[PDB]
Amino acid sequence: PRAPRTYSKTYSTPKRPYESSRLDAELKLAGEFGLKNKKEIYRISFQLSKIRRAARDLLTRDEKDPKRLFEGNALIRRLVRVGVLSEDKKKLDYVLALKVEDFLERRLQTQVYKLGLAKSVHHARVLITQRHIAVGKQIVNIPSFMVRLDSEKHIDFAPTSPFGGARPGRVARRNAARKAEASGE
Amino acid sequence: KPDKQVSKLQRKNKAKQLRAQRILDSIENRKLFEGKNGAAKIITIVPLVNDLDPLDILYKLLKCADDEGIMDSKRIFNVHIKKFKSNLKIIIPDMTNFLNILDCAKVADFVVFGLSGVQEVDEEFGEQIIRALELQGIASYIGVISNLSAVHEKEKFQLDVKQSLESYFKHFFPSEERVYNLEKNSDALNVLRTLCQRLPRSINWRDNRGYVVADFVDFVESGDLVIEGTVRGIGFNANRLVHIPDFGDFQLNKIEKITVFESNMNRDTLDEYAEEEERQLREFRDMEKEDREFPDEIELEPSESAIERLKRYRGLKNLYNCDWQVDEKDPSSPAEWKRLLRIGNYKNTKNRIIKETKNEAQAIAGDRIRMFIRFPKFLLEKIQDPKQLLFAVYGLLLHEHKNAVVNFSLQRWEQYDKPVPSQEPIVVQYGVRRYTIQPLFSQGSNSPNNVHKYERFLHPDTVSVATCIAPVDFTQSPAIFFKPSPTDAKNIELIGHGTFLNADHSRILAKRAILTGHPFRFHKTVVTVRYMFFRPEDVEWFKSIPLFTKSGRSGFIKESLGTHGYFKATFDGKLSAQDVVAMSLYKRMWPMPSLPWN
Amino acid sequence: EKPKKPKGRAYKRLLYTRRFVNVTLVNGKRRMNPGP
RNA sequence: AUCUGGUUGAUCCUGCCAGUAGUCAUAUGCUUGUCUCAAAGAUUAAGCCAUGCAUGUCUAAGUAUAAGCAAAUACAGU
């Protein structure tokens, strides 16, 4: 038969289910950033767990070990590109100090709110899913898209929507017609 | 004595020879339908909508038989499908007569339910067919559609409708997940194969009796009735009685196999022993509302003797502890008692009787038989052509002709909210036979003395027990309860369902009355009470009966006070003018007799 | 009679305002289902 | 790299029972709107099988008088 398609799971569940202090801290994040699930938080802490594991391993190697230089620099290069790590903190020991809020800050949903365009994180999410926002030329309709530092200059309304310059939408058009029909008595 | 360890070989061998036994049993069971000498499977077609016409269903099936020679002003058909070496008998009931539908289904191996893609199933008729058939028992079922093209715009629009129907059908038969579309050759062929190749479920109450479907019926002179067919049940014996659903019990003089088996007459015999509606409905509607709030309360009145009105009643401490005698001599007891059959252990009697019956069977499943029935010739005017109307014959067990005290479980039909008075006559079907019965209602309980409260009305919610005198059934058949109502489109009002529990005469039912009075003056150790009685002579006569408050306190009469029937009494604790004082009196109820129905 | 509750993202928005704005403190130990 | 409830009048222990999290581990219940991707009669019976199909093959280049088709008297296309 054809070779197998590979796949993997992308989140992990906390091990104590009803810890009151954890439950409160999670709900504050969901309200601040407009998430719908706890799963959306578990996804980010799962990613950060793998990043720390990799860095923590390399730090046991000798300095000037060729592997530590090659893979260490790649890891840092990659986190700076998305703006999770500040260009001042460009050192492997600062990678261990990252926290969940640093990743949430870079989602398309929150960027579209900091720039204007939207007047709340809840208003922002609806605009993205309804195909009004473009990044460069491409329409993007996924809220969790991570905005690279070069892309921020190019977020704007899509050319094929109202707000962006096209014809009015279906409901606006219906109303104008019915009024004209009554006025065109 | 030594412990033994299983070697690989003997482990292997034992498993192999157990499989052999299993395989021999499957052949043994399929033998009854084995081939052109074997029995036919009995198929009943039931369209749930007047739109459908059942003959269109039958037509589409036979197209897949790949033999046009198989394929007319009649309603019963015999078919041989050579493609599967299979014999079928097809029955179509006349969908006008609700009671005739139930009868045809009662004898089936497969019921085929027709559904319409165009027209919705009616709640007052189509649903009631399905609901009723379930509750008498069904051997197996198939869901079918035949007109699905009638809604076509694209095939995807057809599938929306089919998914809706599958959801509906699965509500009643949750084991079934697929409804077949006969307009597709593959589906129609799939149905036909199932009817031929698959064994049906049994019906417990049916197969512990004998039954046959008549192939031919003929009369001989003072009358004699000849029937021939194929035996299906546990079997027939010429010493047993024979039931026919519309005409009652009969006796047979010969069996013969198409050896002869005359009635040896060391046998038992046909013997049973050893604008008003607006006012009435409003009366019950008012009375049931009252009894739901103030059960069993009775008012005496001035210028009435409490004695002569009530001298019949006993009065007792507690129903669950009294020593009420079973076969009491009281004159209201019915004229038959020793004449009634009494059983003791119903369980041990029931299964013992069955075990012998299968051993004594003379003709057995798959036999071709002729049967000669001693038949009163004046009834001959009611016989119909067996190619148009189902005629069927059932065996009886030994004592099932004899009347006894019997008990049924009862719960209300799906949405029957009407009040049901305890004394009102009702028709009960259980097994094949049906009888007019006047029940008595009581709550189920585990009273060690078998004494139970009589109740005026059927509870709105709980299951309950119904009691009457009727013939015994040793198969614990399911039961359906209804009253005839010729104004209804199906001439029948369905009231409830349940099961035949047991024959038991030790069940004692106590009717209950409540007297009530007003406390009005209060002292640290006595209370005085008004309006329960009106003469001192009455107050004295009942003095020994205990008293209780509806707040649950208990007390006793001390003595009469004055001439107007006041009395003073003592209680557990502080009463107050909001309390009411009561005392109850009990009377034995006896079952009413019952009559056959048609 | 009573309106439906919103679902998904809009429901978390609702909960957030109960627990971090309209709190009832009842001797400093805030309570979620106070018996009236 | 984490534990909590249960032996007593009350206490500190030994010790087990119950709880907790996962499973490219199966079955089953209730519920089910959208996009991508995808296992599937192994477990018990290496038990028994109706019907149809799953193995054939020609080039300018081994053998042509089909009484095949289509149009250089030994032959010559297909």
Added chain:
RNA sequence: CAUCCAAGGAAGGCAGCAGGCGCGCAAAUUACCCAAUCCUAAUUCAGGGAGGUAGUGACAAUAAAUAACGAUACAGGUUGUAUUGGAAUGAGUACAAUGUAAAUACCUUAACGAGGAACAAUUGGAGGGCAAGUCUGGUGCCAGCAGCCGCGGUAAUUCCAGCUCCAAUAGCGUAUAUUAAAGUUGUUGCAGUUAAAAAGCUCGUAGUUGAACUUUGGGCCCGGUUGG
């Protein structure tokens, strides 16, 4: 074991593909095609249930709708609670083109397609372990609940129903096996006076284990890497 018959005879092997019976807690269509991947032949051409396409499919996995924003009234330090108004959009349906061997579907798109936006989210819980009710009606140690400790005999924080609240969420619960928790299998790393556990005593073969000692120190050149 088992099929046909003119009773003389003849024929058989699905643990290939689809399909049937049986078994059992337990598993899909008797569909389309050689266009792709490759294989065989005398061969560019024929053939291929090998293989591909679609159907069934909550085995497991990824992304992600079920509503956003004004005005008015009231309350409050720009945030809550309720009368009213325009905007935005795909679920779905569909002309067309694209896709494909031919199709279906995805991606694209004219027309149509929200006010209880009825275009109505569930599954388990509310004594403790363990997030969350001194609420209100019923009932009678019974019906029932309860992994464990326990509750219930009118005055129920635990049963049944109604309100309200909690948790995970297109998913949630139950049974069985197994991993972590388990330093309750212990090489790392347990325990043996009184809590389970040192054999009556001594000899002794295999096995495991076995004291110290032999070229140490001192000069002279070259000398690479890193740091200042």
